[PDB]
């Protein structure tokens, strides 16, 4: 379901070569009810990642802030 090759696809005439990483399946909808705690943890991780992305967008693109500041 997540790893196949052209040898197995030979039954389906091997429409795609082995090693392809393109999309080949989709899911209708996920309830995401019992996984509320995991979703909250992922949201916290995404908030941290967004803060890091903003830092990279501002300080890294501006080579930091070379000015006097407060520790």
Residue with token string 């992305």:
53
Sign (positive or negative) of CA dihedral 33, 34, 37, 43 = negative
CB of residue 32 to another protein, shortest distance in Å: 6
Q: Is 28 a residue that touches another protein (CB under 8 A)?
A: no
Residue 44: both structure tokens together: 């916290």
Of the residues 4, 8, 16, 44, which one makes contact with another protein according to CB under 8 A = 44
19 φ, ψ (degrees, to nearest 5):
85, 5
Cβ closer to another protein: 34 or 70? 34
Residues of this chain that bind another protein (CB under 8 A): 32-34, 36-37, 39-40, 43-44, 46-47
């Amino acid at each position: 379901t997540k790893e196949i090759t052209l040898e197995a696809a030979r039954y389906e005439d091997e429409s795609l070569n082995l090693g392809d990483y393109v999309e080949d399946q989709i899911e209708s909808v996920t309830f995401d009810r019992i996984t509320t705690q995991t979703a909250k943890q992922v949201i916290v991780q995404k908030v941290r990642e967004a803060e890091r992305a903003m830092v990279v967008d501002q300080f890294r693109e501006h080579e930091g802030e070379i000015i006097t500041g407060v520790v």
